[PDB]
Symmetry: D3
Subunit: 233 residues, 6 copies
């Protein structure tokens, strides 16, 4: 149907959760959704549709990096009529204002990619989420007893960075964590007039070098899953 | 005291309203503040402190352009201990999603300036406001019956643009209006761990050419002044 | 051992074939090698070890885009001691010098990514494969009766391009096709002193709009696989 | 008449002296001009028209930073028919070739702004003054016995620099001092076929941290005012 | 004694004429110098010392392109203690303010080269000549009755331009003609604290499409050779 | 018939050898080619035609620097129908992988020039040689018992480098040596669909600080000239 998704037209609900890892998406469908159905599996990049509290939710994996994420987000919006995209995932914290198990809401995504300069006149595109989704995240968190840590993330083309000396400057300008897709998810949604947000769970702190156990990673991520599913229903 | 502000240390309250035009600042102090006093007038750039709803509120003009804005808010934060900065002004609309008399909340500020590349490793800094201020703005607007328009603005180094052909692309990427300081205000407050937000009043639509009358301009700006003073009080 | 590969130490042979699509990796293992074993499956990105003419060879998926490829190639080399990396995939031809079913050998990978500027002093890194590997591909292609097309590819961060007007200029400068990882593969191998080559199968011509049928794509990819395994044996 | 200038057509003489501070423009009017008349006061940015030794001369403030300066100069040239723009002011000296009380003629204005790459094809524009104006300055400086230092100046977007370590390299390349607008003045006059020149007075040496006193500062600026008024009458 | 000049210490005079064409240099030696001797010839690039009307004067070729001109200029200043360098040659006119047999004095050289950004913090270096030289060239051409045209040139890395569409814009910004070295000549003299200037003869006009006859060519040139030699004595 | 080459059409053979130093192409003409003949001498840039083991061969000098090399390669290809261009010269070694007297085949040419960004959409053009020339060079050298060292060179605009600290990073990314032309040759030949290759001999070593004596020069260069003539014959 598209080069990277083999779902039937109409297989996706208009609200879609996203993770880089398709096995995480599979985890969510199996453990949290009723009547979950795998609807796409091209390149092993799984997607699902199902129900949370009687409301249709879709789930899609998008792979690693801005360019992979942009492909899947573009197709979801343009072909499968997805309207709200909520990306959840882990991110490595870089600021003293956050600690392990915090959930970060990215109200901006800085980047070392050239993609937004290519998209946007070789100027500075401030890649931002949709405000209404941000507000709904904030209200849902408060009602679930989650204190969201709110600021920028830095979306890098590099997992193994050549600029680790720059993390302090990043944190100084209110970047709470690093990840690798948010700047692309946001720019793509701005391009295509869709609503997007990125929420990140802090499982590793890149400055203090603290890190969650395997058991603390699943329970931490489960709390962010419930935040996400509750703000979509 | 500073080369551009001759206020005594402690003359500014920790919350400050900003406008580019110091005569607008003077107008606010006279008409809307209780017991206002002029606290600075270097280079004719006026600033005031007064009371609103029994509460201390400061006003400061910052001139035109990112470079001028950056001078004044660096000094307010680092010398005068200002903690919260709310910028209000007019902005030229470029998007069909906004019309005359709308108030825009800028949740991102793109730019053609080099200043953030200089600040931020030659990468893309997503210049964003403080989320708690933006939440306060949204809730106050709602109480006042204001239908707040929320999106990016584009902060240009050019009043007379050489890139008019690009306003449609800017609008496509959710830039609601163009102005000349938000990116610098946001970057500087990010740099200095302060809270900032820009609100923009639509007095002219740059695409469809419609314009407010002189009386409608006064009313429109007054509506924004009330919003601003109510969210800080 | 790494965040993205769960193979045991020594699971990888020092020669490794790469594809973006892990399911093609899996196909090669099941159809073309003997005693094939799945050695890694983090994020559904499958990797294999097996034998071709009794010589050990490994296979690994690397996902889409320079950022994803760079992660997997960095890890293969630094942790798993892989020394020779040969990437085969499909590409979108932009030059009249090539047509459907052609196999392109990328002696250079131009890019619109910023990653090599970040890696290399903000100058122009000419990302290139290992000559001996490319010499070896040429000799194997001749002794196989394959008419190897030879030239540059363009690695883009965009599957859905914003610069399709530029494909003719690219073709002028001897870019035969467009893909999305070569420049990252080549730069990573240059950084880490390993040997890499990208081979490119034309299944769609982006100018003439010709395309292969599903049956023909199977046949065309199978020949490229043979060239790859032969030059590794 | 223009959004930023209050004057009626013909209020401005074709020659105009400029400073960032409107209160210096006001000081020049009162102390040095006969029949002086305030002709514009938008945003408290003052301008005047008067006579010096029977010659009609205009004065205009332009605020701080390239963007603010560019607004005012554009409107002076394109609406008020100003042909010759002479900017005087202070500047922080960075060169061992100059010292307190020296007056510098800016034969080039380097910048960290992006505005000239926006104007000029993303190449390097050498912003320069009009030669005939620079000759009149040299000739008038000699007639008055002023030892005119001649060289480049660096126009920064930052009053509070993030690259103070770079001042030595600037001086090495014959930048005598730092200010914040000459590069935009020069580029605006080049765009609009007008004659512009910048002179600036050293009352503070940024490297040796020598400063003038609140007494020699007044007389230094007077010396420069007289030089400017002379070379225009 | 340098890798590119095989002259002896002291064999250069502190005033030197340069051209890209060494064969044009000999023409100046034979037809204008008394006691003329060839002093260097590596890579067939010729230089001369002789006397003009009783004042000693050197001549040197510098090849084509900024990088070539930078090599020779650097060695002339650093090793042979040249202090004044005057560059003459022809240049394609692009402005309607100049016609054939006009001599252009370049008060600024803009460029599409990256060399000055590498020299100068990736900012905009305004590459300018030494003022007192330019003042000399002005006085000399006047009592010699030459109507010297003064403005900018654009130094390109490209003789065969890929941006011919842009000459009009260059002309708008007071670029009278295009050549290929002035930006590197001026920047190198700034870096090493020497005094340089560049003069330019219009023999071809790139907009209008005239060309001088071969008769008028080394006729217009000699009028500028004379101008040059006159302003060194 | 071009502004920089004197020869008549028909004087150049299709295969052409290139050097920067025109005295060096003269050396080659007198020692190695029978029926040698000088065919151009504009700007003292000499070219020659003769025979080697029967087949006709041309020689041409091109000066120093990408801009200079580009003028000549362009005129050669476009006016004089040259179709193979083989560049030989000396290069400063920067890698431990090569020692003096080694012969380097440049399979890619990185650069600090802006010229390829100007040519190629401000992206990263990977400048590479024609693959068949490089295959000829390798088969020949193997027959002549020469151990060919293959990798990138770095083409710089700077002979006297401002980034000497970066040579280690260049060599880490498989840059064996530095020169000033290869990226311009490779990109001009890509632009104009001609076959080009660069070879250079290591007479000095920039990191270890060796050299060859005046006569070790001449002999190592001869081993390269014989490689070149053999592969064109």
């Amino acid at each position: 149907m598209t080069p990277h998704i083999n779902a039937k037209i109409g297989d996706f609900y208009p609200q879609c959760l996203l993770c880089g890892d398709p096995l995480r998406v599979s985890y969510i469908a199996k453990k949290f959704l009723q009547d979950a159905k795998e609807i796409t599996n091209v390149r092993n990049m799984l997607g699902f549709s199902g129900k949370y509290k009687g409301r249709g939710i879709s789930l899609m994996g998008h792979g690693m990096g801005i360019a992979s994420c942009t492909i899947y987000v573009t197709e979801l919006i343009k072909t499968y009529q997805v309207k709200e995209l909520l990306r959840i995932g882990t991110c490595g914290a870089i600021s003293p204002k956050v600690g392990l198990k915090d959930i970060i809401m990215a109200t901006g995504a800085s980047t070392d990619s050239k993609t937004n300069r290519v998209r946007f006149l070789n100027h500075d595109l401030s890649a931002t989420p949709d405000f209404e989704l941000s507000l709904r995240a904030y209200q849902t968190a408060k009602r679930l007893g989650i204190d969201l840590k709110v600021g920028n993330v830095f979306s890098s083309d590099f997992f193994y960075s050549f600029e680790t000396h720059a993390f302090d400057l990043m944190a100084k300008y209110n970047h709470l964590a690093i990840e690798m897709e948010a700047a692309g998810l946001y720019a793509t949604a701005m391009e295509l007039n869709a609503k997007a947000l990125c929420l990140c769970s802090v499982s590793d702190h890149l400055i203090t070098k603290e890190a969650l156990s395997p058991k603390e990673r699943v329970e931490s991520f489960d709390n962010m899953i419930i935040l996400a599913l509750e703000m979509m229903s």
